[PDB]
Design a protein around this ligand. Structure first.
Ligand SMILES: Nc1ncnc2c1ncn2[C@@H]1O[C@H](COP(=O)(O)O)[C@@H](O)[C@H]1O
Ligand SMILES: Nc1ncnc2c1ncn2[C@@H]1O[C@H](COP(=O)(O)O)[C@@H](O)[C@H]1O
Ligand SMILES: CCCCCCCCCCCCC/C=C\[C@H](O)[C@H](N)CO
Ligand SMILES: [K+]
Ligand code: NA
Ligand code: NA
Lengths: 297, 245, 58, 245, 50, 58
């Protein structure tokens, strides 16, 4: 029981997030209302105070004499699902015959979509994102040819044994999900749920994954978010003997059922490395085009 | 009546006679974690007044050539007062913050500082200049503590993103002819209900001159920028011995 | 239908209208989102709101 | 709340943060000509927004020794924009005007301009000095166009009348320590319902320093006076080919 | 007939001269009323803005 | 169904009868149009109409 007044009257524990704003339906662009001349003292829409941190509240109607316009222009194409639910390339896997990289007929790809700039720049507009996804696998030879070859794709979550050869016992796939498909078949396609241990994936994590001294050698771990590490994607030609053909698997991802939070400035310098915002210090370029003088076009 | 203000929390009070309203980040006030969002089962500790109060941590000098600085939260406070102690003894922490940046001059000085809060402010390096070396920033640059850290390349926020768009984040400006402070309230931002005050900085505070400081010879040339902040709705859990990192 | 509530958007303040043929909802199409917006959250997050007609600083 | 103002008409907006209210000449707002006052039978044209808008026509420099200037209405506008075209193509014209004279300085400058509107401002000449020669002012002095004209003898308004009594006309003062502009609204004044925009100037605008401009060496010495005006309720009739005079 | 809104809501054509002042009868000079001392803040009749 | 009104003909004075399986209406079949015609618009656009029996110019 509580008896001293400061305890009774305290707000310690209020779990309700007091919100100053709320969403309104806006299926179309706003309309324009008729306006006329205003010759007044006291009323001054045009004057603002940007220091406050808010954007100007002045509208067309108050700055010029406007007509009435019934705007039926839709806002549907700018929803998160509209912007993001379009398949883009997020991974390429090579399976050569005579090669330096994967001459053994299998390959392991750590799932990380930050290797391609188009897709990456788009998702990095937000800090946190939660979504489901549709993955499509397009396979062919390096010339774009289709050959009668059978492949196995397996999803290996963190902790499951990664295959170490085309004949690894792990390909028994008694629990992991695998897809068996021919290059001659249409691209394989599957749905993936939101799998992070967190409520969202986060393209930016200002911190370290572990405790301890963060000495120079363990600085490559700054920014590493295990909550974003979903595992490995493994592929192999299905046989006990080497395949007769060199292959390429291109991975496309289409997000769906998207939610995003905390928008941020968009990347303006070329990307250099996966999941790390390093930029070339000697080649810092302006965000856009430049001109010779401010008084000339 | 919008230019004048008083912020009182704990045993501390701040006054200003040249304010520019108050920004409440993303439109919401700090709040404690709900029983449905929570996951850890131990009863949390909510010290209240001993930790939710204003702490004045640092003063920088604004010079005609300053590039700008940043601080990381809650890093700036992990070694200060009762808040720090709690952050060290507990694995889990969560809180909001009221940030009040101060800077006064005269009706004859000029300049404008952009004061903004950027969640998950991951720092990048110049990659050996040529961009061929995959270097990483050292602990002292990622978690600079109370002293903060000076920006090497403000135009790209030392992270390859344009400062020209930083206004998409909660912010205010300190434009000397207008105001002498910026006040921003920030709720707890993260993809988890609680986290480590040591391993993870939820956001960074940036103070960057966009319109350079200027004045005529003879006017006071020392123009300080002081940082004062107060945790709000602090909660801690997962108690054990104190740890500094 | 009678499926699982697996979707990444289950519990969203905006309702979707989708198609599905499997027992797991995350397999469903993207559908149509609801058209609500809240610009103020980012463009006008001030404590004491000021009018269009007034002088912002008084 | 009387010091601040916004004037919006057409596609043009004016702002001021150091105003001194607004004068409405002879206490009445501009209006269109009634069917009982009218006499011409053709249906008039009332272009509206394309001609009733603010036009910024001229800038003069206020010097410690300036005598003052005047402009004639509607003469100042007969060659500008869609208004001018209408004034040239039609025999008949009528309209009111919103005049906004601008002049800012610093809290360290000083001086006061008298801004007034004088209907039927007929200019006189000095009559050969001795007063024996019956001379007349040349067209360029009676209808000076946008450039205006400088007063030769401000004390008698170049017309043998005392400027000391000019305040009996609609006016405002621009006293630097107080305001940076003057705003005067003028209805159509004439003994006829409509008239020629070319042959007859309904009134003159006078801007005359009464308390001389002054400041210390080192303060900005270029202090401009800019003239902006907007026709109101413009009506035209008696259409034919364009004529400039 | 008029159908677009800006036309319907426009004041083009208002022939009534809006007047801010009106005449009052004044057959004699104004009278003087009794007054007393005023020791007040806020009220300042003597101060003007010519 | 519950789709978007994307069709190039949305708001047409003649109604169509189509088939579709996608959320966007422009993906639908051409269907059947309505059989209305207005020859007069092109063949007889005169201000003062004249009869068949009369002498056109009187
Ligand atoms: N930010 C916005 N973007 C697009 N349309 C809007 C917006 N805000 C309001 N509207 C539309 O304008 C109407 C509300 O006008 P109001 O009541 O003055 O806010 C609604 O029916 C909306 O469709
Ligand atoms: N300008 C004026 N000159 C002479 N007498 C006036 C004037 N204004 C008002 N009065 C007189 O004072 C009375 C009105 O006083 P009040 O109601 O305070 O305006 C009337 O009965 C008038 O006779
Ligand atoms: C049968 C094969 C199925 C293939 C399975 C694909 C699972 C992919 C899950 C989507 C994960 C989203 C991306 C997450 C994190 C980023 O790529 C980076 N780690 C950011 O550091
Ligand atoms: K609309
Ligand atoms: Na305003
Ligand atoms: Na007074």
């Amino acid at each position: 029981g509580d008896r001293v007044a400061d305890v009774i009257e305290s707000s310690i524990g209020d779990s309700v997030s007091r919100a100053l704003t709320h969403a309104l339906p806006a299926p179309t662009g706003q309309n324009t209302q008729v306006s006329s001349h205003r010759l007044d003292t006291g009323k001054v829409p045009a004057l603002q105070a940007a220091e406050i941190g808010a954007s100007s509240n002045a509208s067309d109607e108050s700055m010029i004499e406007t007509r009435c316009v019934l705007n039926s222009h839709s806002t549907a194409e700018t929803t998160l699902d509209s912007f993001f639910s379009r398949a883009g390339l997020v991974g390429e896997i090579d399976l050569p015959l005579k090669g330096t990289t994967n001459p053994n007929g299998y390959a392991n790809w750590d799932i990380d979509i930050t290797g391609y700039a188009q897709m990456r720049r788009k998702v990095e507009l937000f800090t946190y994102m939660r979504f489901d996804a549709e993955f499509t696998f397009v396979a062919c030879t390096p010339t774009g040819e289709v050959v009668p070859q059978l492949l196995q794709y397996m999803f290996v979550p963190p902790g499951a044994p990664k295959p170490d050869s085309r004949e690894s016992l792990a390909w028994q796939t008694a629990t992991n999900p695998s897809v068996f498909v021919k290059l001659s078949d249409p691209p394989a396609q599957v749905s993936v749920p939101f799998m992070s241990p967190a409520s969202a994936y986060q393209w930016f994590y200002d911190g370290y994954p572990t405790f301890g001294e963060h000495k120079q050698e363990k600085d490559l771990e700054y920014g590493a978010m295990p909550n974003n590490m979903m595992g490995t994607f493994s592929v192999r030609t299905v046989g006990t003997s080497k395949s007769k053909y060199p292959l390429v698997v291109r991975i496309y991802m289409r997000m769906k059922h998207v939610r995003a939070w905390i928008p941020r400035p968009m990347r303006n310098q070329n990307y250099l490395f996966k999941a790390n915002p390093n930029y070339a210090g000697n080649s810092i370029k302006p965000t856009g085009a430049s001109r010779t003088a401010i008084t000339t076009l | 009546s919008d230019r004048v203000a008083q912020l009182t929390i704990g045993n501390s009070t701040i006054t200003t006679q040249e304010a520019a309203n108050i920004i409440v980040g993303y439109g919401e006030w700090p709040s404690y974690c709900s029983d449905s969002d929570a996951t850890a089962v131990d009863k949390p500790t909510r010290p209240d007044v001993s930790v939710n109060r204003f702490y004045t941590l640092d003063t920088k000098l604004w010079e005609k050539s300053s590039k700008g600085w940043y601080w990381k939260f809650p890093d700036v406070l992990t070694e200060t007062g009762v808040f720090g102690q709690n952050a060290q003894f507990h694995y889990l922490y969560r809180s909001g913050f009221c940030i009040h940046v101060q800077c006064n001059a005269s009706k004859f000085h000029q300049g404008a500082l952009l004061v903004a809060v950027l969640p998950e402010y991951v720092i990048g390096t110049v990659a050996g200049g040529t961009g061929t070396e995959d270097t990483h920033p050292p602990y002292k640059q990622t978690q600079p503590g109370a002293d903060g850290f000076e920006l090497q390349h403000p135009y790209v926020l030392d992270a390859g993103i344009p400062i020209s768009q930083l206004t998409v984040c909660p912010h205010q400006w300190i434009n000397l002819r207008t105001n002498n402070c910026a006040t921003i309230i920030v709720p707890y931002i993260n993809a988890l209900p609680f986290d480590s005050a040591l391993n993870h900085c939820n956001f960074g505070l940036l103070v960057v001159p966009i319109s350079p400081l200027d004045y005529d010879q003879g006017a006071t040339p020392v123009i300080p920028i002081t940082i004062t902040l107060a945790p709000m709705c602090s909660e801690f859990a997962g108690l054990r011995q104190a740890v500094t990192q | 239908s009678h499926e699982n509530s697996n979707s990444a958007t289950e519990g969203s303040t905006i309702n979707y209208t989708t198609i599905n043929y499997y027992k797991d909802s995350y397999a469903a199409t993207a559908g149509k989102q609801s058209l609500k917006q809240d610009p103020d959250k980012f463009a006008n997050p001030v404590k004491d709101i000021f009018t269009e007609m007034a002088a912002p600083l008084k």
